[PDB]
Design a protein around this ligand. Structure first.
Ligand code: SF4
Ligand code: SF4
Ligand SMILES: [Cl-]
Ligand SMILES: [Cl-]
Ligand SMILES: [Mg+2]
Ligand SMILES: [Mg+2]
Ligand SMILES: [Mg+2]
Ligand SMILES: [Mg+2]
Ligand SMILES: [Mg+2]
Ligand SMILES: [Mg+2]
Ligand SMILES: [Mg+2]
Ligand SMILES: [Mg+2]
Ligand SMILES: [Mg+2]
Ligand SMILES: [Mg+2]
Lengths: 52, 336, 368, 336, 52, 368
């Protein structure tokens, strides 16, 4: 059950995504280029792609 | 054959236990009114010009304290609501407590404080009680019975074809908040439980459109809105059409439910009421609700239909159709 | 945001176009998706009730937990016992649904009840953390899943080698989607269009699915998971069928790159190698599984324990038709056990237990 | 500060908890009649020409089954008695159950069977209920609330000087039988519990000497006869003289209590009633009781006096004098 | 708390005493001469003396 | 049976004679009993309220659990810990009240809560049985008690040697009643008559108490425990005082032999030897204790463990006057803690904890 979230914090591998009032930490190991403001697809705690 | 967590989750499996054992073993089940067999939010007892509503509810929510409330506010809220959805005005509460050896005296005090604050809001007094202490490591269990007087009683079987279906507020808040609190799922602003007595909400609608026009009611606690609805459909032997797009759901709840992989329709609500009203009074009831502090978010979600009797039809956002299945049991453990 | 993808208007338009393109259609068109999340979308939004009698959407084996061999589940359990007898206590992490997956010899939950340390986790990182919090114990993650789930494991294995962790092991039961799809082709599973899984695409990109539309001329369509993504894909597919087209449209371009996700691809390649694997209730599919390479063999829990898994372990309980459900050849309602002795609470087959299981999805949503 | 087993043993320590916390934290405690503060066997609610009696009781007896009864017969018996000692006729029962995950379905059925058989004896119907299942290893908890109608209500404060004190039967049977059953203490013939509804007993005396002449009543459950008496003395602010030689006690009970080192006066009775009657009606009430199947062994044990107000004076067999101290808490664990 | 009981069975060292409808086993190690019909004083599960 | 011994008539007659013999009495007569069971009889039946102002009944140290040194209770606990560290787990049996007896370093119950195996038993045979059911463990019984309780232990030790049991050990804390009585004499405890304990007499017979009435001229009276036994004894004592008599009357002839109980005497002698012992809150009384002889030393739990018990362990908590209660010089009601912070449920001193404790008895019965 993957859902979209807006990145509001990056710290190397870890990131803080907000899914509409609900925030969770996500590993950016597969989306190094990630950065605040982005919108990633999170699967099992990992960002797998950004949205355009 | 053993008892499973499912047998007490308010869903279908629990329905089996009630039908396969409880109702099947007890033979004396009524006092000249709505009785055990009806499995309504409470029982009714004719007393001349009026009826006495009788209800009881155990509470085993864990942890005892959670965002928005606690086992104490829940005990008072739950009982008052069950009396309220029967169309009765809370008269008195009876409070039983089963405390686990070792509980910190401060916890008991904090629970009693909340019960008191909550009871004063109705208002309704706690006129009698019982206290037991066990070595079992259970912390605390709160069982509350309540008596109320209903000029005109309402049951889950009064829904008529063409009637409108309403909810007093957002759906899924108590069950999702509590689940999120468990899995440490943090929020931009914590998702709170909605636990609260809603007699004022019911009373308001009645004091606006009259009791005769409130054909059915039920607080969607264990097993959620889907269960409360599936229960009304069956007993009233009518079908129920619900439009997903009109069901009020907080953004935080939608989000957490998806991550949690559970539906906000199948989890308990502790501060809401489902109301089936005469089709020509829906708007006034809605507005009457919108004017209360606890019904600001009320909404007409559907109508009683003649097809699919005993079932609940869901019209999805994109316009598709599917049944809103009554959960096998509430998804969340120790939700109440 | 993405409101359009759920818009009741955008949907009712797509539904109308689809009806139009089909009222003139002869025979029947069958579109197969191979992702449980798509099945959830289709079923949750009642999309089937919006389709014309001659247009069908069937669910393929888009459930990694459902297809994980029982032989592998039993193996993991045998190793837990073998370790116990060797004084070594192992910490086993598994996903929630996998935790309850039945086998002739019981589930991971049945094990838990025997005093073994089995923990449910939402991802591999959870397992990684447990590894650092319990150095006096070997933490192992029974790892099933498709490309989308393989990647987080391929990445966690990297972060583990650098850190030089010695108590971070996993039982690989990873599988590849494109291969299984081909196998179904070579075996008669009927469908004239393929809705390629959104997320598995995100990883292997549109490129990973080309070898299929080229070698069999099947029109594929990478789609997202919003209700309008699937409706779009269906329309797009109906048309490439009517016009005899045979190509791949990336309807999910907002989330998928043609090349896909390079990092993950090599990240996975750096540790796993395509191998022959068995799919539960389906058979042994060629080059459809992923196992750890000879080097990163120290990360595989089986490189420390060799167990004898009994032969002839039946894949399913008698009466269960999950194998046919997995092939898109059967509906869960066709099953005699569906909603009877088999439900999410008390499942008989894996298709009902899994979150992406087609049976669980049908049950959970009251299909018409 | 922690909650101790003593806080739920119905004795003095539990009285402390009620006064140090419960009554002290709850502020709304009555509905125009006997309320929580009174700590009577139930509450009263004026309803025109008559009153509604409201009572609730949790049950946690272990084992669930024991010589003479079970948790099910106890639930119905306990609630009906509390309504009965208030002077009310049982009208309806509300049954809450908290079942431990794993209980054998057969046990639940057996309990429900006993509840049913017991309820039919009154007779009184179980009109509403609740079912919860917990992972805690508790087997089962039964909480029963009950409503009754009392033409004339009776309280623990109506005892007058000169009145006579009666018990409907032998004292110490339930608590000693259950304790003996625990320590494997075998009998020539097993000592049985006395658990049973005794509304018929109260009704009989009333239907003989009239309600106005029944100045006080209480079923001596947790903490025994001593506690029930010490409770009446205090609230009626009168003194109570009891003659040890007139207190009915089975030979088996005397024997087991000595071996157990506990007094049969401090243990719970589940099928008895203490009644304070007008001095000139004692004999008729006694005989009225003796004519019932459950009051065959009734006996006048003492009289309400003016000295030692709030205390209970015991005249021993040899003629000595001493106070009958209210236990700190019921001696036996999980007695109810 | 020693109480009187009537012996209703002897078997070498063990004995079965009845204390008014309540029976219990007692060691006769200190009252070998004990025998059915007797009345002994039992202390902590031992007969310490017969009654006359 | 024995109805007379409880007869309200027989009692009211004895009460009248006593009043008669005392209305003419000058000064005051003080009768002391040294058996908690007698204190229970006196208090339970309200006998004090039937006595004339010039006749007093005081309770001596008739409570073996109350007088067991804290040093011994702590020792036993230290040995439990010492065994644990030595891999050896011990099964400790104790009586119910002893189980809760407080010490500066906690009770046996406090130990139980630390995961130690402490079991409450009603007699030594219980301990013996546990020994046979748990051969893989050393079962030990903290054994306190007077002659009446010593005998069952002296008999169980015999049945144990024959059986040649190696896991049947006990910590002896046995005491002798007659000696302590003499000590109280040499220390001023005032009383002109002695109600000798019924059951301890049954064992040592009337003969065991003679050395006292002869060496101090104190009139003793072996009594039973029915209310009329004690009333009789009081009357008998008042008269031997008025007539200057100085002998021993065996009012409890129905249960006591002059020689007492020979078997038990030798049975006890075969294993224990009179030694100097400390009485909690009272001091070290000469030849008042019983310890296992050098031969049967293998039955003593201390012959397998040597622990260092800290010095200066206070005998009682501040404010507690159990020492004076034990001497018959104080009433529990004289104590500031009585019924306040000290009750049977939450005891401060040993006199309140013990079943034969004078404080517990006064509390339990609502003394006038
Ligand atoms: S319902 Fe159950 S039993 Fe039928 S195939 Fe689906 S999982 Fe197998
Ligand atoms: S009451 Fe307590 S504290 Fe006072 S002496 Fe008796 S036991 Fe010691
Ligand atoms: Cl509920
Ligand atoms: Cl009670
Ligand atoms: Mg309800
Ligand atoms: Mg209810
Ligand atoms: Mg409810
Ligand atoms: Mg009660
Ligand atoms: Mg209703
Ligand atoms: Mg009562
Ligand atoms: Mg009560
Ligand atoms: Mg009661
Ligand atoms: Mg309920
Ligand atoms: Mg009363």
């Amino acid at each position: 059950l993957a859902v979209p979230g807006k990145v509001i914090e990056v710290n190397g591998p870890v990131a803080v995504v907000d899914f509409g009032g609900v925030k969770r930490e996500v590993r950016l190991d597969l989306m190094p280029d990630t950065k605040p403001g982005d919108w990633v697809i999170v699967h099992t705690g990992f960002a797998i792609e950004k949205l355009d | 054959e053993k008892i499973k967590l499912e047998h007490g989750a308010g869903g279908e499996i629990m329905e089996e236990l009630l039908r396969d054992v409880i109702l099947k073993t007890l033979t004396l089940k009524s006092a000249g009114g709505i009785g055990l067999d009806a499995l309504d939010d409470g029982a009714t007892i004719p007393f001349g010009d009026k009826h006495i509503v009788f209800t009881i509810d155990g509470h085993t929510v864990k942890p005892l304290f959670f965002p928005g409330g606690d086992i104490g506010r829940l005990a008072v809220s739950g009982t008052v609501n069950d009396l309220a959805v029967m169309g009765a005005e809370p008269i008195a509460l009876a409070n039983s407590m089963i405390i686990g050896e070792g509980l910190d005296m401060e916890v008991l005090k904090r629970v009693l404080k909340s019960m008191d604050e909550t009871a004063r809001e109705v208002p309704v007094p706690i006129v009698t009680g019982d206290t037991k202490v066990v070595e079992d490591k259970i912390e605390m269990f709160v069982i509350t019975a309540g008596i109320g007087i209903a000029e005109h009683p309402v049951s889950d079987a009064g829904a008529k074809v063409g009637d409108a279906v309403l909810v007093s507020g957002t759906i899924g808040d108590h069950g999702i908040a509590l689940m999120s609190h468990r899995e440490g799922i943090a929020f931009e602003t914590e998702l709170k439980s909605d636990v609260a007595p809603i007699w004022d909400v019911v009373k308001a609608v009645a004091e606006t459109i009259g009791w005769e026009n409130i054909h059915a009611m039920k607080d969607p606690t264990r097993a959620g809105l889907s269960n409360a609805l599936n229960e009304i459909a069956r007993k009233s032997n009518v079908g129920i059409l619900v439009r997903e797009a009109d069901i009020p759901i907080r953004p935080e709840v939608r989000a957490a439910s998806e991550m949690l992989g559970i539906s906000p329709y199948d989890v308990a609500n502790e501060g809401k009421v489902v109301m089936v009203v005469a089709r020509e009074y829906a708007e006034e009831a809605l507005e009457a609700m919108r004017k209360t502090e606890k019904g600001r978010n009320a909404a007409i979600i559907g109508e009683v239909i003649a097809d699919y009797r005993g079932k609940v039809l869901l019209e999805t956002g994109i316009g598709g159709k599917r049944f809103m299945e009554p959960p096998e049991g509430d998804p969340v453990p120790r939700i109440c | 945001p993405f409101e359009a993808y759920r818009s009741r208007e955008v949907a009712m338009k797509l539904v109308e176009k689809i009806r139009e393109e089909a009222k003139t259609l002869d025979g029947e068109i069958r579109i197969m998706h191979v992702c449980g999340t798509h099945e959830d979308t289709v079923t949750r939004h009642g999309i089937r009730s919006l389709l014309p009698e001659n247009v069908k959407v069937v669910s393929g084996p888009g459930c990694p937990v459902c297809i994980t061999p029982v032989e592998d589940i039993v193996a993991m359990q045998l190793i837990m016992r073998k370790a116990r007898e060797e004084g070594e206590e192992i910490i086993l992490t598994t996903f929630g649904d996998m935790y309850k997956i039945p086998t002739p010899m019981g589930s991971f939950a049945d094990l838990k009840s025997e005093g073994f340390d089995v923990r449910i986790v939402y991802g591999i990182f959870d397992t990684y953390r447990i590894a650092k919090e319990n150095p006096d114990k070997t933490v192992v993650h029974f790892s099933p899943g498709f490309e989308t789930t393989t990647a987080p494991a391929a990445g966690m294995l990297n972060v583990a080698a650098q850190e030089e962790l010695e108590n971070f092991k996993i039982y690989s039961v990873h599988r590849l989607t494109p291969p299984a799809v081909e196998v179904l082709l070579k075996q008669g599973t009927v469908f004239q269009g393929l809705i390629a899984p959104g997320h598995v695409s995100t990883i292997i990109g549109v490129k990973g699915w080309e070898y299929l539309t080229e070698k069999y001329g099947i029109p594929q369509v990478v789609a997202g998971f919003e209700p309008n993504d699937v409706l779009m894909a269906i329309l797009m597919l109906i048309r490439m069928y009517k016009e005899g087209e045979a190509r791949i449209i990336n309807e999910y371009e907002r989330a998928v790159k043609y090349e896909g996700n390079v990092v993950a691809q090599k990240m996975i390649d750096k540790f796993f190698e395509v191998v022959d694997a068995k799919w539960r209730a389906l058979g042994v599919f060629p080059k459809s599984g992923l196992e750890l390479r000879k080097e990163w063999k120290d990360f595989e829990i089986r490189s420390f324990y060799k167990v004898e898994v009994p032969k002839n372990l039946p894949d399913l309980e008698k009466g269960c038709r999950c194998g046919a459900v997995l092939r898109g050849l059967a509906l869960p309602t066709d099953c005699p056990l569906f909603g009877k002795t088999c439900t999410p609470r008390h499942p008989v087959g894996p298709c009902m237990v899994s979150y992406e299981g087609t049976c669980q999805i049908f049950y959970k949503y009251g299909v018409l």
